[PDB]
Amino acid sequence: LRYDSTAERLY
Amino acid sequence: ASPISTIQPKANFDAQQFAGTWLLVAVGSAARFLQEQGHRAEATTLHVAPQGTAMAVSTFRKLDGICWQVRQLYGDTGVLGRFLLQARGARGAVHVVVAETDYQSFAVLYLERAGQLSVKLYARSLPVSDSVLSGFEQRVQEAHLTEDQIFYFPKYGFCEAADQFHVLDEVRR
Known part of the structure; x- marks a missing residue:
């Protein structure tokens, strides 16, 4: 699991 | 740039x-x-x-x-108010700046990766003042983003905590 804060995306 | x-x-x-x-x-x-x-x-x-x-x-x-709880570390870049979310593998670094804020009701943060700027509005509690909302949209316009590129997030369904099985640690390299 990863978190891209720029797009508030948890994938 | x-x-x-x-x-x-x-x-x-x-x-x-x-x-x-x-x-x-x-x-x-x-x-x-x-x-x-x-x-x-x-x-x-x-x-x-x-x-x-x-x-x-x-x-x-x-x-x-x-x-879920995601743990990150906003590193000190040597400039007050500017922080760094270090790159991890193919995941590019994210630059952060805390711009407008009164510490007590709202905060406007900017995030940047690969030269693409993003703007976020935070609040200590709801509702948010009309003044702050309009101010935020003004900053979005100045960031060369349109009204169709503004996304308002849910006002309910917040998480107060997460159990040990749902903690994503993005601090330890």
Whole structure:
């Protein structure tokens, strides 16, 4: 699991 | 170019006053993901705690109906108010700047990766003042983003905590 804060995306 | 380098950080930024809980209100971004899945946003909460000149930041939000906690470290870049979310493998670094904020009701943060600027509005509690909302949209316009690139997040469904099985640690390299 990863978190891209720029797009508030948890994938 | 680096749009975030032209953004003035909160003068004499005080991490002590910025610490605590912040509720995510909106994001202005040209990110493809938001344009296609923005209407699927989850109530998001941020918890900040000073760690020397850096800031430990936890983000709380649900995923598939379950509360998660993401742990990150906003590193000190040597400039007050500017922080760095270090790159990890093919995952590019994210530059952060705390711009406008009164520490007590709202905060406007800018995030940048690969030269693409994103703007976020946080609030200590709801409702947010009309003044702050209009101010945020003004900053989004100045960031060369349109009204269709502004996404308002849920006002309910926030996560207060997460169990040990739902903690994503993005601090340890």
